[PDB]
Write a structure and sequence with these properties.
The structure is cut from a larger assembly and holds 1 copy of chain A (about 425 residues) and 2 copies of chain B. By secondary structure, chain A is mainly β. In chain A, about 0% of the residues lie in helices and about 45% in strands. The chains are: A mainly beta (about 425), B mainly alpha (about 50). Chain A: InterPro entries: Centrosome-WD_assoc, WD40/YVTN_repeat-like_dom_sf, WD40_repeat_dom_sf.
């Protein structure tokens, strides 16, 4: 792995759409690095304020930065430092903001589900939002960005506002069959709005943007479910992470459950089980005084038994490149990552860690699932058995509690507290 | 037997919690309406004091 | 087993609707304080 310095003050970070830039947030400034030139600085944005959120616009020309209990949205064009805009329409609060894709605009969320006034950066045009339910959650753009489905609440009933995004206007306002909207997804071909209801009902409401329900993933009425959901990067396929350690894999062509993949606990009971673990080791050769007392990711088939609230929830349904695998994990498996293999629709490559799993990312372009757990190591479910990328003394205590991974899956961003490690992992590919 | 009555009825308790929730949501709707109402007349011009 | 599972499924959903109620009662207090701040 190629490394940059240990970025001081890197409270958090985001990376750009084209993966060329990394924005590092320091409490009073954002550092921008052009990773392609080297993992070095370009621009810096500073302010006399406390930053809690930042977003790169999807052209990577500006960064949206939102200031804390100051209700201030600050917009900086990186290619034009003279274009500084602020949204200080503070009487109502500016609790959050998100970028509106090619509309060149900011959706700024007022407090109390009042407004999510759109602030065009070219002309303001401040259309009111009829009581938005949330800031980011429930705000979901269609795959081509044509429509945005916004969770909204009026007459204390959830509904989805359907916004046509070019004119940023309400069109197919729709009452959604929910108890409580959690989020909204659009189908990959934009054939439907997949609506994620509250975990209480275990249901997915599939609505045509033009007519209301197409289908429903049946509720169980009285159990928690639909803990998470994701759409794979296939022509279309979705799978729903329930809250009973099971994923309902749905073929979106017909919206039917093709299968139910259950995590269980017994590795041996999966007909194709392959089990690995993180285990104690020594360093690779030819290492010297760097010391040892390290770990490696190894196969260990002997392992059969694997280790309310955040328990039994499917923690993810994340799809691999071309979705041949689903990385998932369970809230009930603090120490392991479950990888489902599809087309087998069977569990395989079950990974136990010595460090409770904090998360993982499928790499774009194949797999090599990146697994992190706050250990100053990146573990990978290398297709070619196993891999661990040890991080150096150059950041010896860095934990890696959060990981970003570039779409151009060459650059890795490791985040801890005021500290970031930026690099180029074993990415020869 | 008591467990059958655990199941019977927490569907009801869920329903009563739903009513309480709805009661709160409605109060908040009315309260949000008061907030929109006051803002529309107070800040419409008083925003100038601020800006 | 069949029963206890359902019963717990029910308890789990109650805990989540309770959390929604709390978000709302707290939003309620916050709304009142904002209005009062505005009037005063």
């Amino acid at each position: 792995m190629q490394f940059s310095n240990i970025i001081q003050g890197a409270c958090s970070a985001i990376f750009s759409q084209d993966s060329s830039l990394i924005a590092i947030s320091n409490g009073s400034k954002i550092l921008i690095k052009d990773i392609n030139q080297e993992l070095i600085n370009r621009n810096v944005y500073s302010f006399q304020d406390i930053i809690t959120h930042m977003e790169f616009s999807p052209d990577n020309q500006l960064i949206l930065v939102v200031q804390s209990n100051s209700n201030t949205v600050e917009v900086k064009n990186f290619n034009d430092e003279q274009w500084i805009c602020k949204i200080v329409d503070q009487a109502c609060g500016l609790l959050h903001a998100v970028w509106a894709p090619d509309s060149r605009s900011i959706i700024t969320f007022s407090d109390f589900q009042m407004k999510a006034t759109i602030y065009s950066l070219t002309d303001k045009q401040q259309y009111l939002i009829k009581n938005p339910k949330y800031t980011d959650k429930g705000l979901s753009f269609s795959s081509d960005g044509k429509f945005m489905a916004l969770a909204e609440r009026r007459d204390i009933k959830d509904y989805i506002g359907i916004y046509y995004t070019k004119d940023w206007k309400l069109v197919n306002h729709f009452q959604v069959d929910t108890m409580d909207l959690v989020d909204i997804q659009w189908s990959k071909d934009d054939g439907s709005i997949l609506v994620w209801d509250s975990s209480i009902n275990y249901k997915f409401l599939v609505y045509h943007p033009s007519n209301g329900l197409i289908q429903r993933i049946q509720p169980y009425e009285y159990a928690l479910g639909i803990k998470c959901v994701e759409l794979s990067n296939t022509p279309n396929f979705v799978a729903i992470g329930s809250y009973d350690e099971k994923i309902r894999l749905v073929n979106t062509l017909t919206w039917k459950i093709i299968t139910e993949l259950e995590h269980k606990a017994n590795i041996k009971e999966y007909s194709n089980a392959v089990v690995y673990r993180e285990q104690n080791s020594t360093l690779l050769n030819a290492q010297h005084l760097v010391d040892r007392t390290t770990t490696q990711f190894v196969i260990d088939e002997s392992i059969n038994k694997l280790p309310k609230s955040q328990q039994s929830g499917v923690t993810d349904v994340t799809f691999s490149f071309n979705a041949n695998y689903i990385a998932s994990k369970s809230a009930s498996f603090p120490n392991a990552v479950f990888i489902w293999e599809v087309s087998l629709l069977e569990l395989r490559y079950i990974i136990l860690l010595q460090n409770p799993v904090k998360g993982f990312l499928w790499s774009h372009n194949s797999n090599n699932l990146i697994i992190y757990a706050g250990s100053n190591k990146i573990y990978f479910w290398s297709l070619d058995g196993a891999s661990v990328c040890e991080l150096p003394q150059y950041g010896k205590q860095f934990s890696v509690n959060k990981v970003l991974w570039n779409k151009n899956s060459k650059c890795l961003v490791l985040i801890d507290r005021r500290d970031a490690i930026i690099g180029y992992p074993p990415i020869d590919l | 037997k008591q467990l059958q009555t655990e199941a019977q009825d927490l569907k009801f308790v869920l329903q009563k919690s739903e009513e309480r929730c709805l009661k709160l949501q409605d109060e908040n709707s009315a309260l949000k309406n008061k907030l929109d109402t006051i803002s529309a007349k107070v800040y419409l011009p008083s925003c100038e004091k601020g800006f």
